[PDB]
XYZ file of N, CA, C and O in Angstrom:
464
model
N 99.025 -25.555 -210.390
C 100.453 -25.454 -210.686
C 100.679 -24.199 -211.507
O 101.376 -23.274 -211.021
N 100.131 -24.284 -212.816
C 100.270 -22.964 -213.577
C 98.998 -22.013 -213.424
O 97.890 -22.496 -212.989
N 99.246 -20.755 -213.791
C 98.229 -19.701 -213.780
C 98.327 -19.233 -215.191
O 99.228 -18.477 -215.492
N 97.536 -19.842 -215.988
C 97.628 -19.655 -217.564
C 97.417 -18.128 -217.939
O 96.580 -17.519 -217.360
N 98.125 -17.651 -219.069
C 98.056 -16.371 -219.485
C 98.037 -16.067 -220.941
O 98.594 -17.050 -221.577
N 97.412 -15.053 -221.552
C 97.235 -14.890 -222.886
C 98.484 -14.304 -223.680
O 99.229 -13.547 -223.172
N 98.784 -14.738 -224.935
C 99.953 -14.396 -225.696
C 99.872 -12.932 -226.194
O 100.751 -12.254 -226.863
N 98.580 -12.111 -226.040
C 98.279 -10.857 -226.547
C 97.395 -10.140 -225.520
O 96.883 -10.755 -224.467
N 97.055 -8.847 -225.710
C 96.103 -8.191 -225.057
C 94.826 -7.819 -225.847
O 94.807 -8.010 -227.021
N 93.719 -7.633 -225.161
C 92.388 -7.456 -225.631
C 91.253 -7.824 -224.660
O 91.282 -7.441 -223.574
N 90.524 -8.787 -225.241
C 89.373 -9.141 -224.635
C 88.974 -10.593 -225.046
O 89.093 -10.868 -226.163
N 88.366 -11.365 -223.957
C 87.840 -12.701 -224.417
C 86.813 -12.785 -225.349
O 85.886 -11.877 -225.276
N 86.711 -13.798 -226.143
C 85.692 -13.962 -227.315
C 85.050 -15.428 -227.205
O 83.853 -15.503 -227.455
N 85.727 -16.430 -226.770
C 85.258 -17.694 -226.566
C 86.102 -18.472 -225.598
O 87.218 -18.079 -225.058
N 85.489 -19.498 -224.904
C 85.850 -20.375 -223.901
C 85.674 -21.862 -224.292
O 84.742 -22.401 -224.345
N 86.817 -22.286 -224.872
C 87.033 -23.646 -225.449
C 86.948 -24.730 -224.350
O 86.312 -25.742 -224.573
N 87.814 -24.526 -223.439
C 87.812 -25.454 -222.213
C 86.574 -25.372 -221.232
O 85.620 -24.555 -221.765
N 86.588 -26.129 -220.101
C 85.610 -26.047 -219.059
C 86.106 -26.010 -217.767
O 87.244 -26.780 -217.328
N 85.631 -25.158 -216.801
C 85.867 -24.980 -215.492
C 85.618 -26.138 -214.709
O 84.550 -26.654 -214.399
N 86.770 -26.863 -214.339
C 86.868 -28.024 -213.415
C 87.173 -29.288 -214.213
O 87.361 -30.388 -213.614
N 87.036 -29.373 -215.670
C 87.451 -30.533 -216.476
C 88.849 -30.859 -216.574
O 89.677 -30.451 -215.785
N 89.288 -31.563 -217.671
C 90.575 -31.905 -217.901
C 91.158 -31.292 -219.204
O 90.287 -30.760 -220.084
N 92.402 -31.339 -219.513
C 92.990 -30.796 -220.770
C 94.096 -31.735 -221.397
O 94.844 -32.351 -220.573
N 94.199 -31.817 -222.685
C 95.410 -32.428 -223.428
C 96.541 -31.754 -223.123
O 96.657 -30.500 -222.512
N 97.649 -32.101 -223.888
C 98.986 -31.606 -223.867
C 99.249 -30.247 -224.522
O 100.153 -30.096 -225.305
N 98.226 -29.367 -224.389
C 97.969 -28.142 -225.148
C 96.800 -27.940 -225.923
O 96.761 -27.380 -227.015
N 95.692 -28.559 -225.352
C 94.384 -28.178 -225.953
C 94.157 -26.581 -225.842
O 94.540 -25.941 -225.056
N 93.428 -26.109 -226.954
C 92.887 -24.620 -226.990
C 91.959 -24.401 -225.785
O 91.173 -25.251 -225.595
N 92.098 -23.174 -225.263
C 91.443 -22.793 -223.985
C 90.609 -21.548 -224.127
O 89.502 -21.490 -223.764
N 91.135 -20.476 -224.987
C 90.448 -19.222 -225.105
C 90.724 -18.597 -226.484
O 91.647 -19.030 -227.216
N 89.905 -17.613 -226.778
C 89.979 -16.736 -228.022
C 90.011 -15.388 -227.493
O 89.153 -14.971 -226.560
N 90.710 -14.520 -228.141
C 90.813 -13.024 -227.826
C 90.652 -12.156 -229.110
O 91.026 -12.637 -230.267
N 90.089 -10.923 -229.002
C 90.119 -10.014 -229.942
C 90.951 -8.871 -229.520
O 90.847 -8.318 -228.562
N 91.801 -8.334 -230.476
C 93.018 -7.314 -230.170
C 92.296 -5.963 -230.082
O 93.123 -4.974 -230.331
N 91.134 -5.736 -229.465
C 90.378 -4.621 -229.146
C 90.681 -3.332 -229.999
O 89.899 -3.128 -230.924
N 91.776 -2.544 -229.795
C 91.953 -1.266 -230.438
C 93.473 -1.148 -230.955
O 93.933 -0.066 -231.444
N 94.281 -2.250 -230.787
C 95.661 -2.187 -231.464
C 95.465 -2.367 -233.039
O 96.128 -1.572 -233.776
N 94.521 -3.050 -233.417
C 94.213 -3.298 -234.844
C 93.399 -2.265 -235.488
O 92.988 -2.469 -236.638
N 92.990 -1.278 -234.827
C 91.911 -0.319 -235.174
C 92.162 0.396 -236.522
O 91.372 0.587 -237.390
N 93.390 0.712 -236.788
C 93.943 1.300 -238.063
C 94.092 0.235 -239.262
O 94.004 0.545 -240.309
N 94.141 -1.028 -238.851
C 94.554 -2.143 -239.656
C 93.375 -2.999 -240.115
O 93.276 -3.577 -241.185
N 92.300 -2.996 -239.360
C 91.052 -3.662 -239.501
C 90.327 -3.354 -240.605
O 89.613 -4.147 -241.245
N 90.174 -2.023 -240.972
C 89.114 -1.457 -241.792
C 89.244 -1.909 -243.341
O 88.133 -2.162 -243.688
N 90.411 -1.954 -243.756
C 90.532 -2.257 -245.258
C 90.099 -3.747 -245.445
O 89.247 -3.945 -246.450
N 90.459 -4.656 -244.853
C 90.045 -6.149 -244.912
C 88.515 -6.243 -244.526
O 87.808 -7.022 -245.177
N 88.090 -5.427 -243.489
C 86.611 -5.432 -243.161
C 85.667 -4.933 -244.205
O 84.638 -5.550 -244.447
N 86.040 -3.905 -244.894
C 85.446 -3.524 -246.269
C 85.592 -4.437 -247.354
O 84.507 -4.839 -247.776
N 86.783 -4.837 -247.644
C 87.005 -5.607 -248.954
C 88.316 -6.357 -249.247
O 88.273 -7.429 -249.918
N 89.365 -5.870 -248.545
C 90.738 -6.432 -248.875
C 90.978 -7.854 -248.554
O 91.854 -8.543 -249.006
N 89.998 -8.426 -247.598
C 89.994 -9.751 -247.229
C 90.006 -10.872 -248.421
O 90.458 -11.919 -248.304
N 89.456 -10.388 -249.648
C 89.245 -11.247 -250.651
C 90.536 -11.488 -251.644
O 90.605 -12.375 -252.237
N 91.641 -10.595 -251.360
C 92.760 -10.658 -252.227
C 93.903 -11.804 -251.757
O 93.589 -12.411 -250.605
N 95.000 -11.614 -252.322
C 96.243 -12.670 -252.021
C 97.453 -11.746 -251.685
O 98.383 -12.228 -251.056
N 97.526 -10.500 -251.931
C 98.613 -9.637 -251.687
C 99.001 -9.529 -250.206
O 98.099 -9.405 -249.339
N 100.234 -9.634 -249.730
C 100.675 -9.848 -248.429
C 100.299 -8.776 -247.314
O 100.649 -8.909 -246.202
N 99.658 -7.664 -247.649
C 99.170 -6.535 -246.767
C 97.662 -6.428 -246.799
O 97.092 -5.746 -245.882
N 97.033 -7.009 -247.712
C 95.499 -7.137 -247.925
C 94.979 -8.406 -247.286
O 93.919 -8.419 -246.649
N 95.600 -9.535 -247.620
C 95.133 -10.785 -247.322
C 95.066 -11.298 -245.828
O 94.766 -12.417 -245.545
N 95.107 -10.329 -244.912
C 95.370 -10.626 -243.515
C 94.213 -11.261 -242.743
O 94.336 -11.974 -241.756
N 92.897 -11.291 -243.324
C 91.868 -12.084 -242.781
C 92.160 -13.714 -242.840
O 91.648 -14.369 -242.068
N 93.020 -14.060 -243.785
C 93.573 -15.398 -243.870
C 94.543 -15.730 -242.633
O 94.864 -17.035 -242.313
N 95.137 -14.786 -242.010
C 96.163 -14.783 -241.051
C 95.775 -14.604 -239.717
O 96.288 -15.246 -238.747
N 94.792 -13.732 -239.476
C 94.282 -13.364 -238.146
C 92.704 -13.162 -238.064
O 92.231 -12.573 -237.037
N 91.998 -13.403 -239.155
C 90.616 -13.220 -239.270
C 90.247 -11.756 -238.824
O 91.074 -10.660 -239.154
N 89.150 -11.359 -238.185
C 88.793 -10.039 -237.457
C 89.578 -9.788 -236.139
O 88.932 -9.709 -235.158
N 90.946 -9.983 -236.367
C 91.794 -9.532 -235.384
C 91.931 -10.320 -234.102
O 91.881 -9.729 -232.940
N 91.802 -11.592 -234.246
C 91.622 -12.595 -233.237
C 93.003 -13.304 -232.975
O 93.969 -13.347 -233.793
N 93.141 -13.923 -231.599
C 94.409 -14.707 -231.372
C 93.703 -15.923 -230.316
O 92.974 -15.516 -229.503
N 94.434 -16.927 -230.452
C 94.008 -18.178 -229.681
C 94.946 -18.543 -228.460
O 96.167 -18.085 -228.536
N 94.460 -19.143 -227.468
C 95.303 -19.346 -226.206
C 95.255 -20.891 -225.933
O 93.990 -21.399 -225.976
N 96.132 -21.496 -225.468
C 96.252 -22.981 -225.268
C 97.010 -23.357 -224.057
O 97.910 -22.616 -223.590
N 96.761 -24.645 -223.428
C 97.290 -25.124 -222.326
C 98.946 -25.350 -222.491
O 99.283 -25.463 -223.684
N 99.678 -25.466 -221.474
C 101.036 -26.015 -221.607
C 101.232 -27.573 -221.668
O 102.039 -28.051 -222.498
N 100.467 -28.324 -220.871
C 100.610 -29.671 -220.730
C 99.300 -30.487 -220.088
O 98.291 -29.801 -219.925
N 99.346 -31.767 -220.240
C 98.111 -32.673 -219.788
C 97.894 -32.314 -218.266
O 98.724 -32.351 -217.370
N 96.541 -32.345 -218.021
C 96.220 -32.282 -216.506
C 94.682 -31.931 -216.375
O 93.938 -32.280 -217.127
N 94.536 -31.228 -215.170
C 93.222 -30.782 -214.624
C 93.226 -29.202 -214.832
O 94.349 -28.727 -214.798
N 92.023 -28.613 -214.894
C 92.040 -27.141 -214.979
C 90.923 -26.520 -214.081
O 89.921 -27.212 -213.809
N 91.296 -25.509 -213.422
C 90.557 -24.892 -212.264
C 89.347 -24.075 -212.748
O 89.011 -24.068 -213.807
N 88.670 -23.458 -211.839
C 87.646 -22.485 -212.168
C 88.336 -21.290 -213.033
O 89.367 -20.658 -212.684
N 87.528 -21.148 -214.204
C 87.901 -19.874 -215.036
C 87.847 -18.651 -214.224
O 86.938 -18.307 -213.502
N 88.900 -17.602 -214.568
C 88.934 -16.315 -213.845
C 88.279 -15.345 -214.871
O 88.173 -14.184 -214.459
N 87.906 -15.721 -215.987
C 87.520 -14.698 -217.113
C 86.378 -15.323 -218.076
O 86.093 -16.417 -218.035
N 85.625 -14.240 -218.631
C 84.525 -14.544 -219.508
C 84.470 -13.693 -220.762
O 85.399 -12.639 -220.818
N 83.739 -13.898 -221.715
C 83.565 -13.187 -223.006
C 83.177 -11.764 -222.658
O 82.009 -11.321 -222.327
N 84.194 -10.715 -222.837
C 83.982 -9.438 -222.499
C 84.903 -9.031 -221.300
O 85.144 -7.667 -221.135
N 85.384 -9.897 -220.562
C 86.480 -9.471 -219.647
C 87.705 -8.951 -220.432
O 88.252 -9.565 -221.390
N 88.177 -7.724 -220.002
C 89.303 -7.123 -220.552
C 90.707 -7.822 -220.015
O 91.000 -7.651 -218.934
N 91.265 -8.673 -221.055
C 92.469 -9.420 -220.574
C 93.683 -8.766 -221.273
O 93.725 -8.227 -222.409
N 94.830 -9.005 -220.503
C 96.243 -8.429 -220.956
C 97.238 -9.482 -220.580
O 97.171 -10.201 -219.805
N 98.396 -9.498 -221.584
C 99.298 -10.445 -221.627
C 100.021 -11.130 -220.426
O 100.443 -12.434 -220.515
N 99.930 -10.374 -219.422
C 100.471 -11.065 -218.089
C 99.655 -10.539 -216.891
O 99.965 -10.844 -215.697
N 98.739 -9.559 -217.034
C 98.103 -8.665 -216.257
C 96.671 -9.155 -215.673
O 96.200 -8.653 -214.660
N 96.059 -10.160 -216.130
C 94.597 -10.534 -215.827
C 94.319 -11.873 -215.374
O 93.498 -12.042 -214.495
N 95.064 -12.878 -215.764
C 95.046 -14.241 -215.441
C 93.851 -14.926 -215.756
O 92.667 -14.495 -215.313
N 93.865 -16.047 -216.740
C 92.698 -16.566 -217.207
C 92.095 -17.698 -216.475
O 90.822 -17.930 -216.533
N 92.975 -18.525 -215.898
C 92.587 -19.818 -215.122
C 93.950 -20.510 -214.646
O 94.871 -19.935 -214.981
N 93.759 -21.510 -213.897
C 94.965 -22.404 -213.453
C 94.969 -23.749 -214.107
O 93.951 -24.245 -214.143
N 96.175 -24.245 -214.525
C 96.285 -25.632 -215.003
C 97.147 -26.429 -214.231
O 98.143 -25.853 -213.612
N 96.786 -27.694 -213.887
C 97.365 -28.446 -212.848
C 97.522 -29.935 -213.256
O 96.400 -30.569 -213.288
N 98.748 -30.386 -213.464
C 98.841 -31.836 -213.803
C 98.533 -32.891 -212.916
O 98.552 -32.706 -211.691
N 97.892 -33.883 -213.522
C 97.360 -35.156 -212.751
C 98.595 -35.862 -212.010
O 98.532 -36.032 -210.893
N 99.454 -36.396 -212.841
C 100.801 -37.005 -212.365
C 102.010 -36.427 -213.130
O 101.844 -36.236 -214.361
N 103.181 -36.485 -212.630
C 104.344 -35.816 -213.301
C 104.919 -36.831 -214.367
O 105.814 -36.483 -215.199
N 104.544 -38.049 -214.465
C 104.952 -39.052 -215.416
C 104.501 -38.812 -216.821
O 105.231 -39.210 -217.693
N 103.474 -38.043 -216.912
C 103.015 -37.472 -218.171
C 103.834 -36.457 -218.982
O 103.435 -35.931 -220.034
N 105.035 -36.088 -218.539
C 105.970 -35.224 -219.181
C 107.455 -35.692 -218.812
O 108.174 -35.380 -219.865
N 107.802 -36.581 -217.956
C 109.150 -36.947 -217.794
C 109.283 -38.335 -217.039
O 110.319 -38.584 -216.142
N 108.228 -39.212 -217.146
C 108.212 -40.350 -216.315
C 109.377 -41.469 -216.507
O 109.891 -42.062 -215.604
N 109.618 -41.660 -217.948
C 110.767 -42.706 -218.239
C 111.220 -42.669 -219.771
O 112.461 -42.665 -219.937
N 110.429 -42.339 -220.649
C 110.696 -42.209 -222.061
C 109.991 -41.054 -222.928
O 110.114 -40.899 -224.024
N 109.499 -40.046 -222.057
C 108.410 -39.038 -222.573
C 109.220 -37.913 -223.260
O 108.550 -36.903 -223.822
N 110.429 -37.954 -223.382
C 111.373 -37.067 -224.292
C 110.937 -36.984 -225.628
O 111.464 -36.272 -226.565
N 110.088 -38.036 -226.155
C 109.514 -38.101 -227.610
C 107.925 -38.064 -227.414
O 107.282 -38.264 -228.424
N 107.465 -37.494 -226.328
C 106.038 -37.335 -226.031
C 105.748 -35.919 -225.538
O 104.437 -35.509 -225.444
N 106.742 -35.131 -225.237
C 106.664 -33.782 -224.515
C 107.674 -32.746 -225.106
O 108.800 -32.856 -225.286
């Protein structure tokens, strides 16, 4: 149904999900590193600024070593992964895997307006 995609560009770092298994209503699927967008911004915290609390130094508490996580939309099954750790991925350009719901009742069956 879906062809899932990352909220940023960079490169894959981890594979939380499994090719051919199931997914919860938004289980975490991938991790990315922001490659060279962060190249000017990484160095201060990588040396030392990570230890502080000031809003421009403290960024290791907000994004670690320049990572972003990716998650499913809804409950279902999930296809063969299209990517691995080191595949260069981009926000609509590379496509990570497909997500495919088991039945449609798990989002709008009768009362699911307080479940979805």
